[PDB]
Amino acid sequence: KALLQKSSELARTAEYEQVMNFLAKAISEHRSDSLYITGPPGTGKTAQLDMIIRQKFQSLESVAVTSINCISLGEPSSIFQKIFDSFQDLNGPTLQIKNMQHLQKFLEPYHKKTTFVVVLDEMDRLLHANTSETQSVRTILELFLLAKLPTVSFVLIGMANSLDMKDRFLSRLNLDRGLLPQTIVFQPYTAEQMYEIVIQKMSSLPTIIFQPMAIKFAAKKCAGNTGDLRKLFDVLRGSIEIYELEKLNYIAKVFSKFVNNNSTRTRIAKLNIQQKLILCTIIQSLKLNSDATIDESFDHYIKAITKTDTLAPLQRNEFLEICTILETCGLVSIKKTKCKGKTKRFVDKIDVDLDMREFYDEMTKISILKPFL
Template identity: 40%
Template sequence: MMLNGRKRPFLAFESDGELGCGNSENMTPDAKRFSGLTTPPASPEKKQIKKPLGIVSSNLTNINDEPYTIESDLKPKRLMFGSDPIFSKTKSLLQQSSVSNLEQTWLATRKSEYDEIMHFFHNSISDRESADNSLYITGPPGTGKTAQLDLILRDKFHEIILDPKNKKVTKHDPELLNTSYFETQSDIFQSIAVAKVNCIALSKPECIFQKLLLEIVNGKYKQQHHKACDSVKNLKSFCRSKPNTHFIFILDEMDKLIKQTTVLSSATKIILDLFLLAKEPGINVTIIGIANSIDLKDRVLNRLNLQKELLPKVIHFHPYNSEQMFEIVRSKLSIFPACFEIFQPMAIKFATTKCSGSTGDLRRLFDLLRSSVQLLELESLKGNSDKTRGRKVTITHVAKAVSKYMNSATTKTRIAPLNIQQKIILCSLVHRERFDLNKCLCTVEEAYDYYVKLLKRTDVMKPLSKAEFFESCYSLQSSGVALIEFTKKKLLPSGAAKTIKSTVIGTELQEEISKIDLLKRLL
């Protein structure tokens, strides 16, 4: 095998010893592997590369204990969202679900409401003959009603008891779910079963009895109770069969039971049956209703002419004022002090003033502040990072967020969520402004007097008390249909007072109100 008198080079799979020429001991390692092949392998041979035992640290060594250096393109790259992580932290702290203090059981500025609820629980659970066995918690949206009750259930109702001094702790009934222990006295614990139902999720009000039972019955026993509990009578029988357990039934958004049916008497009977269930002698049941409607008790229960001891205890969650809102924001952001420092204090106070003038809804406040942070973050991304590094959220940022959240909704969408009493108050404001030739400033007190006179003349509905009227006015401002301001002008008798005016278009309001027969006479 000669080419031009020269011996051609051997291939990787050939050697001098092939075809019987030479000794296999002298063969190269590649020739040994490919011995017997007449043609090269179809695929090129991949060379083995020694790799380290893991590429998780730049300090690793290979199998020969030689230093191993990760190439720069193999190192993980850090992804940056936004120009500064402080923005993400701040927006996270301003989420509604974030908790500012895990050590205390009451929400910021809600210590008095917490004390009232705890006093109610102690009376209801420890004393079976107590009159405090039904509770109605009311207040505008975003005032902490459900959140405060959830905190109490989390911290004061114990799933297990660690090393109790009183060894005679009642064991939970194996047929029940959502059980816990409540300490009625020192080292005296009562077995509790809690059923919490959001009434918005009910297809029809009549399902409430079955839904409550299914929340506390173990899966093994649900089949036998699923169809049996279709009335308050069946629910009552089940509770009587568990004398060692105290039942707590919580109805969140209870006023939705009335809105889900056109027959008011049917919904009224269901609510009445639930509250009277707690008043039954020899039964361990506590009923708690939560609703935004401040007049539900008057519309549904007081009209039934019940005895005073049969009516539920009422706890009002009043709207947050500006100072309370500022304290809540400060306590939330104080977890990371740098998050509080990116705000100008006057910017937070401006936002709290805007929101407290409505319902005092914290959810609206958190939305405004998060939107303000986003505006600052966008500015930092667009501009020079060195110039924007020391900037803070200012009143200008908050004002832009306010115009976005509060002025973008149409009159129709702003009026739709209002309850009947709020719509009546709005109609009285518009009615007065329409017939006020001098366009005088109207104080909140004057608006209340006009509202009472208008209702007495039209006989549409019984007027609210002054405190309830003021609370509803703040709700109107939160919804963007009214504006309350502290005005200092010589035209006012006292020189300074809170004035109120509507912020809706009269023709659009007339169109929406005309759909409700009850309110047609007000405009």
């Protein structure tokens, strides 16, 4: 029963039909349309263009069109080095890849005059690099300039996450210049183009690959906040091993991990009634909305416990251990914040994820914290 679901985990898209119109001159060897391909994240958009060019290169005339990933540069030189790697040649590399005018000499081909288009992968690392109008916008500016006179032009295909980048362009560039205009976006496929690809990615079909309306149910009730349904099939591939482990069932398993302690399991964290007392003690110190030290909390803990004698006053060292019991369940977090007297000195400020509405319910059942409120 394994080998049917061993193969489970692994032209084709209805977005490739768009881009061949957008590359309408790429089979007639002319300069194509003006390509700035954006997208909200997770939407397949990195592999989307990679699907096109791999279908382009396997289809396509002299054949040399290269694509490089802009991740580890922070600087516009070695991209123009990596276009030279499809030549397998040798030259003086440093000057030719550095200046704007130095790129222009690089664009005279050798063997058969096939035009070249570059593909700039993950442009947002250089967009969201160092300060905008100094280097990175200038880097954006310099690449999109295609004023070259022969039709051999370095057509850009760049990609980005957040859609602020168009308004970042200068008003000269927004005057119908370069690869600007066609701001081709990709709205996140709800279930209406992505699930059908999963259907065709179920070409080798096992018998029980589950009631597919539940798969449709999975698609409809994941599409609130999602972009990657194969990865959201990779959460089906984990639950398909649950039915192997036991020889949207799992989204139900995963949300109760996150929703609880405020409604119900707050009292699970405080089986000690003193842990209930010390939890209200933190919030009474939160009146002075300050750097809530473990000492200022201990200050209000003593000066209240001398008034109402519910228990004896305990140690600060005990007060250290008891607040860590509050910590490991995930209620209150402790951080070493800032005080700048001698050096960067670290006093510990706490923060609570509970509200007084979710407090007042669980304390009226216990009239021993009622003196303390």
